[PDB]
Structure formats: structure tokens, C-alpha cells
Point group: C2
Chain length 641, copies 2
């Protein structure tokens, strides 16, 4: 015998209503015969064939094919001794008709010499087009012929065909059946074929009709047809492992290269957004305008005042002397005649402030500087600059305030120096010494970059892994490759290697553009930064594993990834210090995947701390624990599935 199904049982659904399909079978197939499995719906027999090959299991009963159990020991149905054609077209669209045969030839372990001979034979037999045409460019009928060629190409000894003749010209279906009869008659082979044209399967040596959940009858066509003296069959029915890893790796690196959309999305988007972020976010505002109502000098234009004075003693004007100390980068002076037009300009939106030096500014400032603590109230109001600022914008309102006081500090120090005096006399008692861990003029982009790097690397892996594992299982490609002999260990190993290479390339590009091209500093060790980025990428890949394990449609996976991409970015302190959140939220947010990693990377970049500091290796510990947790969850989900 070849297959000895006995007392088979199966049921879909749940306890509320189990879909009772394929119950209490009795099927047997002998060597050298063309079996025929006929039915009504194209899924009561697909389940049986899937159970026979080994990609599914029966609830009760015994199953026996080609020596032993379908897929553990003795039998060879998960091996190269069975040819399988899935009901759908389980083929890759980026391959030629020659590469799509060389791939399976390497998977089945055949020498490359015989593949060409069998390729020419199958091309002659099936009159397929030129062997260099891509599969995705073929029509819907030649794909089935290519799949038939792939099924026959390795010379199996038990052919299991799932509707091979549906959209085929009858002048070719006749040849197909003749070929099956030829190879089965004398060879030590067997054929199991399911068809929808009951009358077509007249050359089968045995026909088993499937009705409800069991084989209705089992007999040769002649005896079955002559039992009732029928005229038609429809009337009766109306009563080494390294060789299989290289091929997977090559196909994985080729499928990503012939799809320009994927290459763009996962290689030119990170670079573009890194460039945009470095060019736009974090820089100091420039070009801010001011309204100057300096009444100590005559008014000529709105862009000219003739601010001239003396750089020595005698303190000529001291209102042009102060304005000379204002920074020329972030402030552009504009001149107005009276203190009402200036505030009107601020109100309408033509400026950010007003100054209004009083016409008695010098004669009162040089009196305040000399009188000291015994100064009358008159020479304390006519010796001041009155600033009406626009505080609707926080960042712009901070820079203006800071630069209107640093300029006065420089003004006072210059006054003291030009008078041959100690310049420390113009200093507040609070004395800010050299910063311990930074510079006196910090930047905001150096705070956001370690946390944009990790965000990019983490969230560009979940999508790729989820899509690659969803659009491949749902198309019947993983199941087709499994029957060829590829164990699940090799598929996972190849996928991990491919994803590792992709994330290594992404990390290289992002770190080259952030640190070398632009001015983002790195005071720590670059090797540990690379290791942390790669570990975050692996954590993202494990999250993609979980997402693809619990999801079955490619549109639900994107929703699930997007629903978790926002809160983690908003809670991990990427764009604002984590010290601002409330106490309860600050404790919850440290258990998220990206919080401690971002903190440790920021410490590495902006302080230079080694690996021994707890604030540095807590990120590594958190990332490793999250990888382990994601792997455990992914394995647990696939238990009841």
C-alpha cells in the first residue's frame, strides 16, 4: 500500500458548533494505481490531502503513509519522496522560470546537471513560454503549468495533486492524463488526484467518491459504472542542512532587491528623516525682530538710526553702546519714532518686543552708577530700559530674555574695563563655575537624537518582520516549502540572519549621517552604541514575531503596530525629559521597552559613561529581558494555534 487512512476524525470550529468534517474515514491506496478523489466543495478533500502530506493533524484515529507516521519517523512524506501541488499557486513572482526550478532543485538536493534536462523536458511537454520570463508576468493559466512542472521536477514516488487541471485547454488535459497513466502503469509510483470534472477521471484505476464526511464508495470506474449499467460517472454520483539554508538565504536576499518599493521604504526613509530632523529640529531661532525707540538719537528711517558713540571714557550715549552689544544673529533691529508705534507693531505682529531708551538715559545711568545705595527714585526710573515682550512662544520668549541680559552683562563688563577697574564688580554673587558634564550653551537636538536612532531602528523591524511572515504564510509558501523538507529551524535561522543584515545596514547609515556628516557628538564608546542599537533591533524583530503570530491579516498587523508605536514614543522620554511626568506615571514608564535604553544611550553619548555605570547597563538588561519576554509570549501564543 501507499496510504492507509483508518478511522480518521477531524472537526473545526469550537464547542458551540464544531464543523464536523472528515469523520470516520476508511481510505487505502495501492502502488501502481491512479487514485481519484471526488467531491462537491473544494475543502473537504483539501483537508484530507493536508493531513496526508503532514501539514495538519487529526483529532483521533490513525494515519499511515509510505511506511509510518506522516512526518515523524519511518515515512518520508515531509521529504523528497512525495510531490505536492497546493490548491492555490504557491510561487514567488520575482523569479524566472529557470530560477524557480533551480531553487527547488537545490532544496531537493539534485545536481544542477539534471535540472536542465528535466527543465527542457517539462517545457517541451507543457509548451510553456521562454524559460527566462518572470512568473509574475505570466497569466493565470501558465502559473498552474509552472507549478505542475515544479511538482514533477524531482521525480517523486507518491504524487499528490490538488486540482491540477482547472483552467487548462482540453487538448492539454488529455495529454496530462495520458502522461500520468504512462508513468503510473509500469513505474513504482502512485498518484492521488482530486478533480471537479467527474467525467474526466475515467482513466483512474480507482475512484473514491467523497460525500458528507466519509468515502461514499471505492471501486474501479468500470465496475462502478456497470453495477447500475450507467452511462456516465456523474450519473453514478447522482444516486546536509547547510545546502537548504544557502538557497533560502539567496532567495531572501533576491526577493528584497527586485522590489524597489521595499528597498526605498526600508533604506531611503530612515536617511531622509534623519536628515530632516537634524536640519529642522533643535536649532536656535534666528532672525527675530525688535522695535527700538531709542530717543537719544534723531530718527531718519525704519532701517537706519546712525548709532555712533565713543569707545573710551566720557560715556557719550550708552544707549547705542548697549545696542552694539546685542547679538547680530538672532536679533534684527527695527526703528520706530514713538513708543506707541512700537507696541502697535508688536500687537500687529511685525516684531517681538520694544525697547524705548528714554532721552535722559545717559545722564541718569551715570548718576545711578555713582550714587549707589543712596539713589533717589527719580534716577532709578529714567535710567532703565522698558521691554514689552511677546511671551506667547516659550522658546522664542526665552532666547530674547536671555540675550537681552547677557548683552547687558557684556555692556557692564566693558564699561568697567574701559574705566580701568575690576570687572568682577559687575557680577551677581551666584557664580556658575565650569560645567561638570557639558557646555554652558547646550543644544536640544543632542537630547532628541539618542531616542530617534532607537525609534527608527526598533520600528523599522516590526513592520518588515510582520509583513514578511504574514504575506508568506497566507499565500501557502511556508507550507509548500515545509513539505519539501525544510524544517522550521532553518526558516527561522535564515530569517534572523536576513533581518540582522538589514538592521546592520540601517544602523550603519543612520550612525554615519548623525555623527559624521552632522555635528552630533559622541563622548563615549562607539562599539557599545552599536551593540545597543542592534539589541534594540532584535527586540523589534521579536515584537514582529509576536504580531505575526497573533495576527492573520496584513491590515490588522499595521493597526496593531500603529496602536503601540504612539504611546511608547510619548512615554519613553524621547522628546521631553522624563522628570516632568507625574510620580505614578514616571514609575510605570520605566518598564516600557524603549525608556531605559534611551536613557543609557543618552548617557553614553552626552556624558561618556562606561558600561559599569548602573544608568548605562540597566538599558542592556531591560532590552535582554524584553527580548526573552517577547520570545516567550510568541511561543505561548502558538500553543493554542
Amino acid at each position: 500500500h501507499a496510504v492507509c487512512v483508518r478511522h480518521a476524525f477531524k472537526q473545526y470550529g469550537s464547542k458551540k458548533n464544531p464543523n464536523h468534517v472528515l469523520s470516520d474515514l476508511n481510505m487505502t491506496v495501492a502502488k501502481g494505481t491512479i487514485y481519484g478523489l471526488l467531491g462537491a466543495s473544494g475543502c473537504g478533500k483539501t483537508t484530507l490531502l493536508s493531513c496526508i502530506v503532514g501539514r495538519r493533524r487529526l483529532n483521533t484515529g490513525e494515519i499511515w503513509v509510505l511506511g509510518g507516521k506522516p512526518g515523524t519517523k519511518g515515512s518520508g512524506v515531509p521529504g523528497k519522496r512525495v510531490g505536492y501541488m497546493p490548491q492555490e499557486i504557491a510561487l514567488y513572482g520575482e523569479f524566472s522560470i529557470k530560477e524557480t526550478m533551480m531553487y527547488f532543485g537545490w532544496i531537493f538536493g539534485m545536481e544542477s546537471s539534471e535540472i536542465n534536462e528535466r527543465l527542457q523536458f517539462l517545457l517541451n511537454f507543457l509548451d510553456l513560454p521562454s524559460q527566462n520570463r518572470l512568473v509574475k508576468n505570466l497569466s493565470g493559466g501558465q502559473q498552474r503549468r509552472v507549478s505542475f512542472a515544479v511538482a514533477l521536477m524531482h521525480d517523486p514516488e507518491l504524487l499528490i495533486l490538488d486540482q491540477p487541471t482547472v483552467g487548462v485547454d482540453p487538448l492539454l488535459r488529455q495529454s496530462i492524463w495520458n502522461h500520468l497513466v504512462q508513468i503510473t502503469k509500469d513505474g513504482n509510483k502512485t498518484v492521488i488526484i482530486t478533480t471537479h470534472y467527474i467525467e474526466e477521471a475515467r482513466q483512474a484505476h480507482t475512484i473514491g467518491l467523497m460525500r458528507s464526511g466519509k468515502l461514499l464508495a471505492e471501486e474501479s470506474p468500470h465496475v462502478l459504472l456497470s453495477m447500475y449499467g450507467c452511462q456516465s460517472l456523474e450519473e453514478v454520483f447522482l444516486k546536509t542542512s547547510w545546502g537548504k539554508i544557502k538557497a533560502l538565504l539567496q532567495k531572501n536576499f533576491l526577493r528584497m532587491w527586485r522590489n524597489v518599493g521595499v528597498m526605498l521604504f526600508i533604506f531611503a526613509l530612515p536617511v531622509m528623516q534623519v536628515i530632516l530632523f537634524c536640519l529642522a529640529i533643535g536649532r536656535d531661532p534666528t532672525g527675530l525682530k525688535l522695535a527700538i525707540v531709542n530717543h537719544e538719537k534723531n530718527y531718519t528711517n525704519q532701517s537706519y538710526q546712525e548709532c555712533s558713540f565713543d569707545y573710551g571714557c566720557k560715556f557719550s550715549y550708552l544707549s547705542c553702546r548697549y545696542l552694539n552689544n546685542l547679538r547680530n544673529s538672532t536679533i534684527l533691529k527695527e526703528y520706530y519714532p514713538d513708543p506707541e508705534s512700537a507696541v502697535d507693531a508688536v500687537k500687529q505682529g511685525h516684531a517681538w518686543g520694544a525697547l524705548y531708551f528714554t532721552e535722559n538715559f545717559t545722564d541718569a545711568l551715570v548718576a545711578r552708577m555713582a550714587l549707589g545705595k543712596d539713589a533717589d527714585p527719580e534716577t532709578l526710573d529714567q535710567s532703565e530700559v522698558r521691554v514689552w515682550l511677546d511671551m506667547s512662544n516659550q522658546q522664542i520668549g526665552i532666547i530674547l530674555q536671555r540675550d537681552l541680559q547677557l548683552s547687558y552683562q557684556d555692556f557692564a563688563k566693558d564699561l568697567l574695563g574701559a574705566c580701568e577697574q575690576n570687572p568682577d564688580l559687575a557680577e551677581i554673587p551666584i557664580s556658575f563655575k565650569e560645567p561638570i558634564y557639558g557646555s554652558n550653551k547646550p543644544s536640544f537636538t543632542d537630547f532628541v537624537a539618542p531616542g530617534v536612532i532607537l525609534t527608527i531602528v526598533f520600528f523599522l523591524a516590526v513592520a518588515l518582520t510582520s509583513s514578511a511572515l504574514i504575506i508568506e504564510r497566507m499565500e501557502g509558501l511556508l507550507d509548500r516549502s515545509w513539505v519539501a523538507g525544510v524544517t522550521p529551524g532553518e526558516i527561522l535561522f535564515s530569517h534572523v540572519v536576513t533581518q540582522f543584515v538589514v538592521m546592520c545596514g540601517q544602523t550603519a547609515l543612520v550612525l554615519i549621517f548623525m555623527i559624521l556628516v552632522f555635528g552630533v557628538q559622541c563622548k563615549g564608546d562607539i562599539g557599545w552604541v552599536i551593540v545597543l542599537t542592534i539589541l534594540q533591533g532584535l527586540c523589534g524583530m521579536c515584537f514582529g514575531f509576536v504580531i505575526s503570530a497573533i495576527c492573520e491579516l496584513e491590515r490588522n498587523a499595521i493597526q496593531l503596530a500603529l496602536g503601540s508605536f504612539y504611546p511608547t514614543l510619548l512615554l519613553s522620554g524621547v522628546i521631553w525629559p522624563i522628570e516632568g511626568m507625574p510620580t505614578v506615571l514616571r514609575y510605570v514608564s520605566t518598564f516600557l521597552p524603549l525608556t531605559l535604553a534611551t536613557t543609557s544611550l543618552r548617557a553614553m553619548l552626552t556624558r561618556g559613561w562606561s558600561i559599569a555605570e548602573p544608568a548605562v547597563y540597566y538599558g542592556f538588561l531591560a532590552t535582554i529581558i524584553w527580548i526573552v519576554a517577547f520570545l516567550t509570549i510568541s511561543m505561548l501564543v502558538l500553543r493554542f494555534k
Copy 2:
């Protein structure tokens, strides 16, 4: 006559790559007959049927159905009087059988009991389960009998069936053929059925063999059998050489398809609410638990949490180093005490503090003599009268807080020293006097700056996702083309989708505005009337961008890449999380032409300043959003015409 095709020519692809499907075809179907159309591929027959019903055109030919050109002036093909069942299953999975039949009964214009009678007949005839069973729960073979009942329910004069008897038992095959023959017999009922089981097609009154884009034999089957001498139908094949009633039905279906999908409700209604809550709790607030290492050598040292800082509030300036620390802000600075200046700095070099203070052992003697000597202070008293602060300035937003809190606390210290001895506190003020701000307050919030940019981005990009996905999904499964044959114009399809989306972001705008303004106290100094109008106008601009993506994309997974490929660059160029003044001179000029750059600036002016529509900075965001609505419609209309 019912259908007349002459000299039909049709091909796909470009000029370089020819894909001739039909070329010099001749067809003729009488009235009261079953045609039957047998082929090989499975796509030429579908193309011929699509050309007959009107959903596809002919490159060169002449088609005459039911009176005239199919869908131009006098042929009743694009509406009722025809029954079309597509090759696929164009059915809605959220509806039961009864709702599915009632929707198509209302589309055609039948009554509420003339649908129930047909339901009662067809359920018994086709052997279907109870009418209260959802379609998605039905098996793959029971979703085809439902389509057959939908096609046969309204009793048209021309049934066009595409592979009816597939995935069905032979008994039901014979029953269906018997019913077709019965309805056709002695009447004006015409059937055109493209079956694949060749031998079953002998019951027809004509046979339509197709090969190489033409028709070899177009004749009766009893003549086909006894003209070639063959006794078969397969072996002879082997011889080589009122618009308000239709908008209402579409609007009601649209809401029940979003209400019955719980995952869709959470993504478009419960996700914006969660984003708003987490933004107001995390982003913008000032740091609070900052720690400082304090070395006060004017007092005995006991603990790392206790120093016994005491002084006299009145006068005589007892200690003045505990007096200054008394003025430090208790909310955002925590005080920890260390015994040596060198031991406190080592605390900063680890993760234990943000600064050190180190008041000298003779701070009071030097400081009092410093302010009582004026400009005659010797260098020695300028050294022991100062506070030495070593800050950790790696963080920009914390170094600013610490620097400002340590100098503000000295203004209060000085203004209380003089003032407690009968002096004017104005003597302790720098000449630069900041009067009352014209706009805002002395303590602006960063979360008030980023707030306008979060409302606009949430609404804009949640309409791109909803419009693109709904239009791509319904078009690819034949649902949109099946409704067009029933008599629903493209005007009624677009009208019902615009209205369905309008109520979607009307609900979204209410929740985003309520939580941000009413609950979390984000100020709104302007008019709330114009904030709602501008926020809604951004939703329609986003929706019109959904039309563009769905017009040029066929697979859903490609739309996400296009939507996400433009969602990231805009947020970094529209000035949402940073002032637009930080950009370079050239990138700033380009950025203002993006959809959200000028609308965010306008909304920020109405919230944080109170400007009205009459200000140029406010209506420039209304005009820049009306222009992008027109541009997005022009781009999408050009693509459909050219493809």
C-alpha cells in the same frame, strides 16, 4: 434580439506589449432563449460580459443590448431590468441574509413585502439556512447561493450569470438549470450563463464556443451533436480545425459597517482620546524632583537629610546662608547635604545630583561687607561672598530650570534684605525692566506651543487612513462595480462617502477639543467658532488626499507605505514640535507650502493670542487649506482619466 456584438476589438497593455483579447467577434442572442458561453481561459468570457453590462469598454466595435448602446441613452443595462452575478462573491460580510436582500431591494426600489415574498421563495428553493445568520459566518459554498438569490430577486428581463454552479452539488446544479429553463420557457426572459462543465450546457438553446478571441461555433447544441457526428459536448470541442432613496440606503449601510467592526471603532475613536491624554500628562511640564548637593560650612553637619538651618527673620543678618536657601523653590529643587566641597562634586559625577552649592565658612562676614562697601570692595571680599555652583549641563531643559531657579531665588533674597531695613526694593533691580507681556504670561508652557500641532495632525492623518482603506477594499472585491450595475451613479457613491466621513471627524473633533481644553485646561484666548471650522477644513483636506492614494494604488499594503512615506517628513517640516524659525533660510521657504505648515501657524495664533479672522496670519491658513483641497481633487481626477 437581445444582445448584438459586431467587430469587437479589445486589448490590454501598451503598444509594445500586445494582449489581444477580442478581435472580430460576432454574437447574437435572441429573446426568450438561454445562450451559454463556453471557453478555456476564464478571462475572455469575463471581459465579454463586462463589455456587455457596461463596466468595461470596447476599443473598437458595436454593442447593442436591450435597445441601445449599453448605458448611453436608451438601454436599461446600467440599472434594473438586468440581473448580473459576478464571478467572485461581491457581498458584505457584516450583514445577515435578510439585510443583504433588503439593501438590494431598496436600491432597485421595491416595497418592504415584495422583498419578503422573494426571500421566502428563494430560501426554500436554494436550501439556505435561517435568514438571521451573518454572511461572514456562512460557508464558502453558501456565499454563492446568496449571490444567486440576490441576482434573481428582482425579476429582470435579462439575467447575466458568471459561473453560477460552482462549489455546489450536482443535485442543486440540476435544480438551478431546471429553474432557469422554467423561467425562460414561453416568455421574454433571456439568460446568458458562462459555465465550465461543458456537458451540462446541452439544455441551452445555443452554444458559444470561444477560441482565439472569436466564436468558432454559434449554433444550437442538437445541431452541434448531429452535424459533426460526435456524441459529446466536450469531444466536439476537441475538433481542432428618485435619488434620495438610493443615498439613504448607502448612508445607513455605511454606518452599520463601522458600528459592527469593533476594531475600527477603537482605532479611529478610542486611539485619538488616548493620545490626547498622554500628551497632556508627559510633554510640556517642568521638571520637579531635581536634587542638589549642598555644602554649608557656616553650620554644623549632622545628616544627609538634615542640617538645622536657622536664622533671625528680622534683621542683624545672622547667617544669610540659611536665609538664601530658605528662598529656594520647594517644588523643583530637593536639598541634600554633604560634608566637603570635594565630596559633593563626586556626587554630581555620578547619578546622584545635578549641582553643588558650597557656601563658604565666612559667607555672612564677606557678603555684608560687600554690599556695605559698594564699588570699594577689595578682591578678597569678592571671593568669599559668592556661591560656587557646579552644574550638570548635559540636559538642556533641566540646565535652564536650575539656572533660572538659582538666580530668581536671589532676587527675592536681595529684595528682602533691603526692605526689612526700610529701603526701596527697586534698588536691587537690573536696568532692563520687563514690563507686562503684551501676549502670554511670564511663565509660558511648552505644552501650549505643541498643542495646536497635535489637533491638526491627528485629524488630518486619520482621514487619509480611513478614506484610502475603505475605497481600496471595496473596489478590489467587486462590491463597487456590483452596485454600479444596480443603478447607483458615481455621484451617489461619492456623495454618501463624503457625508459618512464628515460625521466621522465631526465626532473626532469634539473629543480632541473637549479633552484638551475643557479637561486639561489648555487655554483658548480666541473664538471657538473658528477653531472648529479650521479643524474640520483640515479633515476634508486629508480626505481628498485619501482619494489620490486610492486612485493610484491597487493593493492596500502599498497605500500604507505611501501614507506613512508622507506622514513622517511633514511633521519635521511643519513646525509642530519646534519653532519654524530654527530652520535654514531655504528650507523655511519651501516648508510653508506643505499642507499643515500655514494651518498650524494660524491655529496657534487663535489659541494663544486671540487673533480674529481679520488678521493676515489667521486667514492665510484657511486659504492655504482650500487651495490644497482643489489641488488634491485635480491630481486625483487627472489620474483616473488617464488610467
